């Protein structure tokens, strides 16, 4: 929280051309009734009573959250973490190769870059997260 560290962190957030930043995600409300501390039921219900009736349910995967700055020129693609951080400490080609499965899913007609929220596997290679 030292002013000079925040400042330079941000300076770098700006140079590295980062344009997004993850949220933390809350568990669903507990249900004492249903004897569970994060309740599937009470969670979707919460959305309902708040006027949201159209919802999705993905599977959360054991991995690190990363934002892929998927440049059309696949050489140019870099990664940023749950914080405002360029992911450089990885061999940019093994990374890029795994990233190419993805790359070929798009029409890149006048599209220079797609910013994509993703999980990296295993949680191992990047940070550790729970270890």
């Amino acid at each position: 929280e030292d002013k000079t560290l925040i400042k330079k962190r941000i300076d770098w957030f700006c140079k590295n051309k980062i344009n997004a930043f993850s949220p933390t995600i809350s568990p669903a409300p507990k249900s004492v009734e249903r004897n569970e501390i994060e309740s599937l039921y009470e969670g979707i219900l919460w959305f309902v009573l708040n006027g949201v009736k159209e919802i999705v349910i993905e599977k959360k995967y054991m991995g690190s959250y990363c934002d892929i700055y998927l440049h059309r020129r696949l050489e140019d693609t870099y990664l940023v973490s749950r914080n405002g951080y360029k992911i450089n400490h990885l061999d940019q080609e093994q990374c890029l190769r795994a990233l190419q499965g993805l790359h070929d899913r798009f029409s890149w007609d006048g599209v220079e870059l797609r910013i994509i929220q993703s999980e990296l596997m295993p949680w191992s290679i990047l940070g550790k997260g729970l270890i």
Binding site: E1, R9, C14, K30, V52, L130
Partner: protein, 131 residues
């Protein structure tokens, strides 16, 4: 999964199906399940609610988890994490709304938006670590 409910008692009816489905999300890969609204960003809404299966929770909370359940449940309080998850996403909307072209070391609206996010990281970091 994709669902639109319309009224809270439609929700009641399809719950047991939805409950049965996430019930199978149990393999070593999976933190559990996540619940998002169809629209990714809405006013005052959180991006998601996680609902972690008992096996994964056992890892965040420790091996005595089931034996200590009513305890932990009573201790559980998401009201603060939920607020940050909500504000956090609201920042991201604004960060994304900033044009990629304009990202740079003197976009002092971007610099503000970030400092904001950074501050809210220091806040959300003091919360119950197991959320």
């Amino acid at each position: 999964l994709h669902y639109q409910f319309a009224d809270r008692e439609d929700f009641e009816a399809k719950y047991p199906q939805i409950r049965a489905w996430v019930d199978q999300v149990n393999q070593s890969d999976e933190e559990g399940v996540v619940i998002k609204p169809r629209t990714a960003f809405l006013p005052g809404m959180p991006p998601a609610f996680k609902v972690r299966n008992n096996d994964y929770l056992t890892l965040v909370y420790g091996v005595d988890f089931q034996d200590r359940l009513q305890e932990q449940i009573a201790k559980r309080n998401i009201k603060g994490k939920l607020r940050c998850s909500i504000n956090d996403w609201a920042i991201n909307a604004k960060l994304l709304a900033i044009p990629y072209s304009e990202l740079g070391e003197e976009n002092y609206e971007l610099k503000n938006l970030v400092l904001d996010r950074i501050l809210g990281e220091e806040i959300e970091n003091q919360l119950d670590s197991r959320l």
